[PDB]
């Protein structure tokens, strides 16, 4: 068993004592995690669906149910500078100890991790795809609406997803779009739909997406599975990185320049229930 005491272990496979702290506070930063839900697993999983019902022995039913499997897997590995960059005083970080080492990483590697995840989940821009969810659902089932801002358009967004039994749970609109939510007022029932203090679009919670892609985005789902299994893990090295750039048109010479890199092998999970709406703009 590992103790606090010292620090001279290159393969830093995190124990459950320190695995939870860093994974607890990364979720508040993440947008997709708040929309979705957490669970446990074995390692790779398969989920089942549908509603097999029947009475005692009155009469045998005409229709019959279908039982189908749906799997989820794939990981995501990173190499962050962060604390390997503080190799010139790793002996001072030894004085802080193995325990305090990851506490200083807690708002550093986590901040880099969540920004990538939201670009993969909601958008499909970054190169780490696997559970093609929200971007692909709009392409398959066309739930796109013309760009206007009235209470009728808000009910129209909900009405399309309500057609197939799915309840409207929560909105996703960025901070730039928040300005356009000010002007919405009905003619008969004169009142504010979007409150300024209380962050709620139509009595449902709003989440600001920071990735600069959607200009006037209004996405509604509230049905996902995000999951981080196993160990984040750590590896330190002093080798020449291929996928790296030093200053302008150079490569990271790690032997000469007294640097270090911290490899982090995290796990990702996504599930798709394909009934999602979106709205943007009229012409421009």
């Amino acid at each position: 068993p590992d103790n606090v005491m010292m620090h001279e272990k290159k393969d830093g496979t995190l124990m459950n004592e320190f695995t939870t702290p860093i994974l607890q506070e990364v979720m508040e930063n993440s947008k997709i995690m708040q929309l979705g839900k957490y669970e446990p697993m074995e390692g790779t999983e398969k989920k089942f669906t549908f509603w097999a019902d029947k009475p005692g022995a009155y009469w045998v039913g005409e229709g019959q149910k279908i039982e189908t499997s749906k799997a989820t897997w794939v990981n995501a590995t990173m190499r962050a500078f962060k604390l390997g960059v503080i190799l010139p005083v790793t002996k001072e970080f030894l004085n802080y100890t193995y325990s305090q080492f990851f506490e200083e990483m807690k708002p550093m590697i986590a901040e880099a991790f969540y920004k990538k995840f939201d670009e993969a989940g909601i958008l499909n821009q970054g190169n780490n795809p696997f559970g093609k969810s929200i971007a692909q659902s709009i392409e398959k089932t066309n739930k796109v609406i013309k760009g206007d801002f009235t209470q009728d358009n808000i009910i129209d967004l909900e009405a399309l997803l309500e057609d197939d039994e799915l309840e409207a749970n929560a909105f996703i609109s960025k901070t730039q779009n928040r300005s356009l939510l000010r002007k919405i007022v009905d003619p008969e029932t004169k009142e504010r739909i979007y409150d300024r203090n209380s962050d709620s679009l139509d009595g449902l919670p709003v989440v600001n997406l920071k990735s600069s892609n959607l200009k006037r985005g209004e996405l509604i789902t509230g049905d996902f599975d995000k999951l981080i299994y196993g160990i984040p893990q750590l590896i330190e090295y002093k080798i020449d990185e291929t996928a790296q750039l030093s200053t302008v048109k150079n490569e990271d010479g790690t032997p000469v320049n007294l640097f270090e890199q911290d490899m982090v092998a995290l796990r990702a999970t996504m599930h798709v229930a394909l009934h999602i709406a979106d709205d943007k703009a009229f012409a421009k």
Partner: peptide, 15 residues
């Protein structure tokens, strides 16, 4: 991460 399960649902707004 059994403590992670309960705290995750507590953090998020939807419930």
């Amino acid at each position: 991460g059994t403590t992670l399960q309960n705290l995750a649902k507590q953090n998020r707004i939807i419930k």
